[PDB]
Amino acid sequence: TAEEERFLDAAEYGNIPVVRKMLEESKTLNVNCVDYMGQNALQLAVGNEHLEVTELLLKKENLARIGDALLLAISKGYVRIVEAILNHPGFAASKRLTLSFSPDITPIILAAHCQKYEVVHMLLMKGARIERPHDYFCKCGDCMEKQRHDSFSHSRSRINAYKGLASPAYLSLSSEDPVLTALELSNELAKLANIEKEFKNDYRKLSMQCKDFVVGVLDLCRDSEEVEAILNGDLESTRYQQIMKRLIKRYVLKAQVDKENDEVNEGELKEIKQDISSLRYELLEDKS
Amino acid sequence: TAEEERFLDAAEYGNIPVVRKMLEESKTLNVNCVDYMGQNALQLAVGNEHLEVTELLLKKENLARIGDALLLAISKGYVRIVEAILNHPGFAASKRLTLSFSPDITPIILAAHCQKYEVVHMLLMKGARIERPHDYFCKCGDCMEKQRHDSFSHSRSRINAYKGLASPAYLSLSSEDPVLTALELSNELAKLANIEKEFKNDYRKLSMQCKDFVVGVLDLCRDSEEVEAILNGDLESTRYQQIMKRLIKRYVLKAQVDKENDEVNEGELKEIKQDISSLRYELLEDKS
Amino acid sequence: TAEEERFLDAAEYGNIPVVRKMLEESKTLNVNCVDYMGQNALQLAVGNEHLEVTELLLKKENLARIGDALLLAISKGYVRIVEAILNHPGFAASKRLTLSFSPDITPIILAAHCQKYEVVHMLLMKGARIERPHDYFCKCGDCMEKQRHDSFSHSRSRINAYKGLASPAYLSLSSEDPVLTALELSNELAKLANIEKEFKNDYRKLSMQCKDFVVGVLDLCRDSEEVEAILNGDLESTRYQQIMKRLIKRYVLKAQVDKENDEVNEGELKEIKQDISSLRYELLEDKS
Amino acid sequence: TAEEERFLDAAEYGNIPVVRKMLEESKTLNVNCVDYMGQNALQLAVGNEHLEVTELLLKKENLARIGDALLLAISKGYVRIVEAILNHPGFAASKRLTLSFSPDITPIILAAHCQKYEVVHMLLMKGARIERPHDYFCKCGDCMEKQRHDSFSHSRSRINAYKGLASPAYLSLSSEDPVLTALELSNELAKLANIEKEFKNDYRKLSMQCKDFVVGVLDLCRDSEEVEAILNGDLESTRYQQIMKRLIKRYVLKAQVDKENDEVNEGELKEIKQDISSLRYELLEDKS
Instruction: Assign 3-class secondary structure to chain A.
Output: CHHHHHHHHHHHCCCHHHHHHHHHCCCCCCCCCCCCCCCCHHHHCCCCCHHHHHHHHCCCCCCCCHHHHHHHHHHCCCCHHHHHHHHCCCCCCCCCCCCCCCCCCCHHHHHHHCCCHHHHHHHHHCCCCCCCCCCCCCCCCCHHHHHHCCCCHHHHHHHHHHHHCCCCCHHHCCCCCHHHHHHHHHHHHHHHHHHCCCCHHHHHHHHHHHHHHHHHHHCCCCCCCCCHHHHHHHHCCCHHHHHHHHHHHHHHHHHHHHHHCCCCCHHHHHHHHHHHHHHHHHHHHHHC
3-state secondary structure chain D: CHHHHHHHHHHHCCCHHHHHHHHHCCCCCCCCCCCCCCCCHHHHCCCCCHHHHHHHHCCCCCCCCHHHHHHHHHHCCCCHHHHHHHHCCCCCCCCCCCCCCCCCCCHHHHHHHCCCHHHHHHHHHCCCCCCCCCCCCCCCCCHHHHHHCCCCHHHHHHHHHHHHCCCCCHHHCCCCCHHHHHHHHHHHHHHHHHHCCCCHHHHHHHHHHHHHHHHHHHCCCCCCCCCHHHHHHHHCCCHHHHHHHHHHHHHHHHHHHHHHCCCCCHHHHHHHHHHHHHHHHHHHHHHC
Question: What single letter denotes the amino acid at residue A144?
Answer: M
Closest C-alpha to D251, from D174, D161, D187: D174
For residue D151, which residues of chain B lie inside 8 Å, CB to CB? 224
Residues ≥6 apart with Cβ < 8 Å to B284: A282, A286
The alpha carbon of D132 is separated from its chain's Cα centroid by a whole number of angstroms, namely: 16
Instruction: Provide the number of CB pairs (under 8 Å) joining chain A to chain C.
Output: 48
CATH topology of domain A1-131: 1.25.40
Q: Are D118 and D125 in contact (CB under 8 A)?
A: no
* B266 is an annotated ligand-binding site residue: yes
When CB atoms are compared, the residue of B9, B269, B280 closest to A279 is B280
Question: How far apart (Å, rounded) are the C-alpha atoms in residues D3 and D42?
Answer: 19
Contact B50, B81 (CB under 8 A): yes
- Nearest residue, CB atoms, A275 vs list B101, B151, B276: B276
User: Are D266 and B271 inside 8 Å of each other by CB?
Assistant: no
Query: Known binder of ligand: residue D268?
Result: yes
| Nearest residue in chain D measured CA to CA from C278 | D279
Interface of B with A in 135-194 (CB under 8 A): 151-152, 156
Residue from B5, B15, B36 to probe the interface with A (highest A Cβ count within 10 Å): B36
Alpha carbon B129 to its chain centroid, in Å, reads 13
Query: In chain A, which residues have their Cβ closer than 8 Å to the Cβ of C263?
Result: 263-264, 266
- The Cα–Cα gap between C221 and D105 comes to 62
Q: In terms of CA atoms, which chain B residue is nearest residue A256?
A: B267
**Rg of chain C taking only CA atoms, in angstroms:** 23
B55 in a known ligand binding site: no
Chains B, D: CB contacts under 8 A, how many? 48
B279 CB neighbours in chain D (<8 A) are: 276, 279-280, 283
- Using an 8 Å CB-CB cutoff, list chain A residues near B270: 260
Q: Cβ of C253 under 8 Å from any chain A Cβ?
A: yes
Sign of CA dihedral A241, A247, A252, A253: positive
Q: Which of D39, D9, D30, D10 is nearest to D101 (CA)?
A: D39
- Which of C280, C282, C283 should be substituted to probe chain D, the one whose Cβ sees the most D Cβ atoms within 10 Å? C280
Whether the CB of A128 is below 8 Å from some CB of chain B: the reply is no
Instruction: Decide: C161 and C131 in contact? Cβ < 8 Å.
Output: yes
CB contact under 8 A, D36 and B252: yes
- Substitution target in D74, D160, D268, D276 with the highest count of B β-carbons within 10 Å is D276
* Interatomic CA distance for residues B60 and C170, integer angstroms: 65
Q: Does D288 touch chain C (CB under 8 A)?
A: no
- Residue B120's CB is within 10 A of a number of other CB atoms, namely 20
With b meaning 16 or more CB within 10 Å and e meaning fewer, what string describes D247-284?
bbebbbeebbeeeeeeebbebbbebbbbbbbbbbbbbb
Q: Which chain A residues have a beta carbon less than 8 Å from that of C248?
A: none
Select the residue of A156, A267, A283 nearest C283 (Cβ to Cβ).
A283
CB-based contact (8 Å) between B198 and chain D? Answer: no
Within 10 A of D204 (CB to CB), how many other CB atoms are there? 13
d(C-alpha A185, C-alpha D227), whole Å = 73
Parse chain D into domains and list their residue ranges.
169-263
**Of the partner residues D224, D260, D283, the one whose CB lies closest to the CB of residue C267:** D260
Instruction: Please tell me which residue of chain A has the smallest CA distance to C259.
Output: A266
Q: Is D3 annotated as a binding residue?
A: no
CB neighbour burial string for B224-237, b if at least 16 within 10 angstroms, e if fewer? eeeeeeeeebeeee
Chains that touch B (3 or more CB pairs under 8 A): A, D
Sorted by sequence, the CB contacts under 8 Å of residue D28 that are 6+ apart come out as D3
**Chain D residues with beta carbon closer than 8 angstroms to that of B224:** 151-152
Q: What DSSP character marks residue C265?
A: P
Q: Are A110 and A162 in contact (CB under 8 A)?
A: no
Chain C interface includes A288 (CB < 8 A): no
A271 — contact with chain B (CB < 8 Å)?
Answer: yes
DSSP H helices, C149-265, are 153-164, 178-195, 200-218, 228-235, 239-260
DSSP C96: S
The approach used to solve this structure was cryo-EM
- Residue A207 CA to residue A111 CA, distance in Å, equals 20
**For chain D, which chains pass the contact test of at least 3 CB pairs under 8 Å?**
B, C
Asked whether the beta carbons of residue A282 and residue B277 sit closer than 8 angstroms, the reply is no
C265 vs D: CB within 8 A: yes
